[PDB]
Design a protein around this ligand. Structure first.
Ligand code: ADP
Ligand code: ADP
Ligand code: ADP
Ligand code: MG
Lengths: 30, 258, 256, 256, 259
């Protein structure tokens, strides 16, 4: 029962800078 | 079904019997074990089984059971329908499924870790493999053919190999005679290997074989297999030179100091 | 019913099936004991198919193959509770099979805490749940099956005593076929006809006296798996139907 | 009174119950010399249920179940996910039940390190967590049940002498069954009545003389577990109240 | 600054000499080492040494070398930064850094394996440590206090202990006199524990001590100097349970059968 560098995927994600701009576009009032 | 273009060069009058035996196994879907030693060309026999089966039109992936990662075993064998990134339009395929419709070749069965052993045992007996995530079982139809060189009865005796998956996967075995047992095809393999080497080095012509060379490579216990013999010829033909004289010297092992 | 995928004779499998017929109505757990490779799974299907329990969805899970952390998770892990990690955790095999038959195999090679929690589950039909204090009171039709002598490693404490001692009311024996001495020939016939149909061989030409002598003389460490492998291997090696089989192979690792 | 199960006419049982009455109030460590099957979590229940406070949780369930690294986590848990394998904070077992008492089974099996950690925790009350954070102090009584001689396995040095002397403040040994002479029929009767109620039998028909000879001849390695199983199995196999029982199911795993 | 006397009973003869010697050690900032038999109240003096120091306000933390998880040994000893290895969600303070301006209690140095000896060999002389998966080093000043049970010079010749570490922690040694040799405060310790026990059992008062009990006290070898004397006093007074008379019999061993 140890300290060891391990790895196992269960998630997914992706994003681009213009997508970041588009997602912050909805944080603000009209 | 179609006999693929492979080099089997069989004349030993025992390799012919093995070939007939495996040809009889060509149509059947039952699990097959290939028993041999180092080298011995078991991969050619396995490809022969897969490629002269009814499902030969199917794929022929071949996994190295020593090469699978420990932690990533589940995803490697099965896959995950979820993409690597958000809003992905596809997923990575596991070793299984990628084999459906064809045969799966396994190698270095003995060195397979216990995790691989126990994970593989469960999937074959029932199928219905499920990728990580979701609750949808997928039914698979895969032929298994495996080759090994160690002694799995001894592995079972030590317990480092589970006997249950062996028993499930040992419907019939095919025995491969060692080169020393063949002891008749050595001329033809020697010559074929030399001819291939002639083009590889771009040597102009094959010089020929001397009686002393024939005597020495014939009169050898041959712990090494066909590939060891192949390397032997490779060393001697190059050390000989430009074929102005017949080949005379054979170096059995390039380790003696001199 | 569903017995046609099996045949029991020699006054031993007969009494096993007779006992099964009597204990079939009881939904409460029974205990099945038998060697490796002798009828455990097909008897397991039988208990589910009898009239008491044909309605429910049945599952079978081998506890020998799985690890401790995986085994505790699959039976009941994060069915309703939310915790860091274990994303989209499913209720598990036990919850999915609730309302139907269950067959956990090889109880002897099970983790200690898994055994204790299985006892807690089977006792008064209460299933714990970390996320929800409410216990699942769903009716369960599960019976335990192991091969080794549970008293043997309860003597060394390698098994929880109470788990054995609670469900020790309905012991069932599955004798090895070395004792039957009257079933081998006709199951061999059935397997031979099955493969001749599989490989489109015209007709099974029967057996030989020497083959019968050898098959009755062997000790058969593997009961049914090894029997199938041997008979199919012999039929293959014969590969023809003109004359009865006389060469059989029990160890394919034998050279020549 | 919890139905005060397992009534003993034995003078040894009477005197040990008298002492447990005295150790009930004080928050001192009690070590119960009870062999396996003998008073297993039977007097620890009385000790927790007769103490000054009964509101403190009684989880117990400490055994030789886990290896040393798993038993460490079982005892103390994890420090808020400080290290691999920990997604959240697991208080463990000492923090699980505070203000009450805990119980240890097969503590002799416990590794040297956890023995010494029990030493460090029992005196001050502080519990240094596995993560290394500040130590948190809790007040809990401890009862320990073993089956073997501690003087010998400390003579070999396998027990910390400080731990043995400190934890073994006062020992309470138990009578084994074979010393119990006239209460074996009493246990048979009591268990038979409980069993006939639980299977809703109308009444109990009684014993016989051959059965009494059998219950005089045997050895019964377990003080409770060995005979309760035998008597309940015998009455269950009888399954009737018209005729006094005469068949005894000695071992559930006998052939045929 | 206060007295921090804590629990002090049975002070006479060489024990008073030891207390007088240790009284002036606290101002000094040199490592100290205590030699004594198992259960000779060594921790009591080690704790009081911290309180008698000028920087008595420093937090007090204790580790036992007999209980070191070999898997987590390095992380516990030094300290691990956040994200140094997988599963390390946050930065966690190490034990050495946990005490700054406060003393650290070391125990079972005679049981210290070569592995822990080497890992700890340098952090003492210079007070310098770098966390595992760490970018920059930290410096601290801590007074080490150690307790042991065996002959460290003997283990040095035996080869399982490093003389480098020994002289790293060999400025001065305090030899606690074993009570079975002092023999001058056994009555006082026993009677003190008797009053404590009889008070906590909510009894009216404690009767005297039987002369036969005193006779049989001195005869016993007493492997437990002041850790089994308290226990035997408690158990025997519990056995009696009344203020009726001085208890004639002491239950030296609980394992002895009632008859
Ligand atoms: N009949 C044959 N014809 C051509 N080459 C052969 C023949 N038999 C063996 N070989 C050579 O021997 C080698 C054996 O390789 P392989 O089967 O991978 O050994 P192993 O099974 O021990 O891994 C092959 O690379 C092949 O070139
Ligand atoms: N007549 C038959 N037809 C089909 N299968 C049979 C027949 N008789 C026995 N079997 C097989 O015997 C197997 C018993 O399972 P197994 O786990 O090998 O038993 P054991 O637990 O004794 O090893 C079943 O899987 C079943 O397929
Ligand atoms: N001067 C003293 N007077 C009375 N009791 C003492 C004295 N010094 C120590 N003790 C007692 O000795 C007990 C054990 O102390 P110690 O041997 O330091 O424990 P450890 O086993 O951790 O070293 C303590 O509970 C304490 O009450
Ligand atoms: Mg100490």
């Amino acid at each position: 029962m140890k300290q060891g560098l391990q790895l196992r995927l269960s998630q997914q994600l992706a994003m681009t800078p213009q997508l970041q701009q588009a997602i912050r576009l909805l944080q603000l009032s009209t | 079904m179609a006999e693929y273009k492979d080099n089997l060069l069989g004349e030993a009058n025992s390799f012919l019997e093995v070939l007939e035996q495996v040809s009889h196994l060509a149509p059947l879907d039952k699990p097959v074990l290939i028993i041999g030693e180092r080298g011995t060309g078991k991969e050619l026999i396995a490809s022969r089984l897969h490629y002269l089966s009814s499902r030969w039109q199917g794929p022929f992936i071949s996994l190295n059971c020593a090469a699978l990662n420990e932690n990533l075993l589940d995803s490697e064998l099965f896959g995950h329908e979820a993409g690597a990134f958000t809003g992905a339009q596809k997923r990575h395929p596991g070793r299984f499924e990628r084999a459906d419709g064809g045969t799966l070749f396994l190698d270095e069965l003995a060195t397979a870790p216990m995790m691989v052993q126990e994970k593989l045992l469960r999937v074959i007996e029932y199928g219905e493999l499920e990728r990580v995530g979701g609750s949808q079982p997928l039914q698979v139809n895969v032929r298994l053919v495996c080759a090994t060189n160690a002694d799995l009865p001894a592995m079972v005796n030590e317990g480092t190999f589970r006997a249950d998956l062996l028993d499930r996967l040992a419907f019939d075995v095919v025995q491969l005679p060692p080169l020393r047992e063949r002891e008749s095809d050595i001329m033809l393999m020697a010559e074929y290997f030399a001819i291939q080497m002639c083009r590889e080095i771009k040597l102009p012509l094959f010089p020929g074989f001397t009686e002393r060379a024939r005597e020495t490579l014939l009169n050898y216990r041959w712990p090494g297999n066909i590939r060891e013999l192949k390397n032997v010829v490779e060393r001697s033909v190059y050390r000989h030179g430009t074929s102005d004289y017949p080949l005379d010297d054979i170096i059995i092992d390039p380790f003696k100091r001199r």
